[PDB]
Amino acid sequence: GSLQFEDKWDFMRPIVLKLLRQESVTKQQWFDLFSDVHAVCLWDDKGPAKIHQALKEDILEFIKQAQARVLSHQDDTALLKAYIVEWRKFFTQCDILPKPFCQLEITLMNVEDSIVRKLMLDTWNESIFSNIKNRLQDSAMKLVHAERLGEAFDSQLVIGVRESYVNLCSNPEDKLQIYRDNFEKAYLDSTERFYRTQAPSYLQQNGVQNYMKYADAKLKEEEKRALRYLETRRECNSVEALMECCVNALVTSFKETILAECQGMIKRNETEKLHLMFSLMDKVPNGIEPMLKDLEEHIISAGLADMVAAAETITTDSEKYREQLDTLFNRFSKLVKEAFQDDPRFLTARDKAYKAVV
Amino acid sequence: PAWYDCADAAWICTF
Ligand SMILES: *CC(=O)Nc1ccc(NC(=O)C*)cc1
């Protein structure tokens, strides 16, 4: 009474699939499945070298089934839900299926680092992930592209896709290696592409001081949207890699147009508007250097004629020849409070320009 | 033999 892998596989292979498909399994089938592997990985010569390849082939055949069931929907929404159902089941089988092969994994040589699970998590990456990866993102982004426009959706669809890019990376050195190059990369491109044809239009439609209330409000809405769809669990600077994309796409890409209005806001004393510009050009590298320069030159030329009317009139009354500059300085020492809250960079130019009136 | 217990051990912690 003997037995080989050829005689016993046809009794095992059902139990593999029942576990791969997350189908219910009986207690006796668990023990039969250990007891078959105990028998093949011993009495069979190339037995362990056959459960190894048979199990590659059968895992791969299931993951090809799952890909067809996901790609069965044409609704870019029910297709996201279908991918996560099959994966969440899958990921949850990676903790179960590698157990009846405890002797295989020894005969071929605990916890996560097993050969079977590594075979399961890989084959999902070799196959269904690698093939659907670009569709997975060209669908999830449309649900946020739509979220930016009114369409309320199930925000767990793009979250579930996110935390599925986190769990499939088996790299211990870079855990976010297939999230930082796939999910994060598409969310930056779509956010970028979105504000190249939606934000240049708010500048054609409405004015500039209107666009500043817009770029502002869109850095606030793209941030609380990133603190949902992006990674916050383990620190990665992804949400902040988005705001750099956004600043560049909202504020940096229109700095000259914003800084052109600087000079007149000073003259007309528009402090609520200079504070808004400040809020925007302060997220830009060296963005307020022209701003500083517009308050440094205006202070000068103002205190360059609002002082010439003295040598032709008040020259012997320093009690008046010094007070105009007690008020002049006050015109600018109070613009900075109301507008820049006495930021130390604008005091340096408030002073760099007032030394020239001396 | 004792593999019945390693199977019985795996059935419990998994289910
Ligand atoms: C041989 C053996 O004891 N295998 C074994 C025992 C216990 C567990 N624990 C769980 O599965 C949670 C695994 C393998």
Author numbering:
A (entry chain A): 11 to 119, 129 to 377
B (entry chain C): 2 to 16
Give the published text.
Here, we report a general and rapid method for discovering α-helically constrained (Helicon) polypeptides that cooperatively induce the interaction between two target proteins without relying on previously known binders or an intrinsic affinity between the proteins. We show that Helicons are capable of binding every major class of E3 ubiquitin ligases, which are of great biological and therapeutic interest but remain largely intractable to targeting by small molecules. In addition to possessing increased stability and membrane permeability, Helicons are capable of binding large, flat protein surfaces that are inaccessible to targeting by small molecules, and Helicons have been developed to target a range of PPI targets in cells and in vivo. Characterizing Helicon-E3 co-structures and mechanisms of action, we identified new binding sites for α-helices on the E3 surfaces, as well as potential probes of the disease-linked E3, WWP123,24, highlighting the generality of our approach against this therapeutically important target class.
We performed screens to find Helicons that bind to CRLs consisting of Cullin proteins paired with their canonical adapter proteins. We identified Helicon hits forming VHL-ELOBC-specific clusters and CUL5-specific clusters. Among the CUL5-binding Helicons, H314 from C76 bound with a KD of 530 nM as assessed by SPR. H314 also disrupts the SOCS2-ELOBC:CUL5 interaction in a competition SPR (ABA) binding assay, potentially by competing for the adapter-binding site of CUL5. We further characterized by x-ray crystallography Helicons derived from these screens. We solved the structure of H314 with the CUL5 N-terminal domain (CUL5NTD) at ~2.8 Å resolution, H313 in complex with VHL-ELOBC at ~3.5 Å resolution, and CUL4B-specific H316 from C77 in complex with the N-terminal domain of CUL4B (CUL4BNTD) at ~2.9 Å resolution. H314 binds at the very N-terminus of CUL5, the binding site of the adapter complex SOCS2-ELOBC, consistent with its disruption of the CUL5 interaction with ELOBC in SPR assays. For instance, both the H314-binding site on CUL5 and the H313-binding site on VHL face the Ub-E2 binding sites of the cognate Cullin CTDs, providing a potentially ideal configuration for TPD applications, where both the E3 binding site and the ‘linkerology’ of heterobifunctional molecules is critically important to optimize ternary complex formation and the geometry of the E2- and E3-catalyzed reactions.
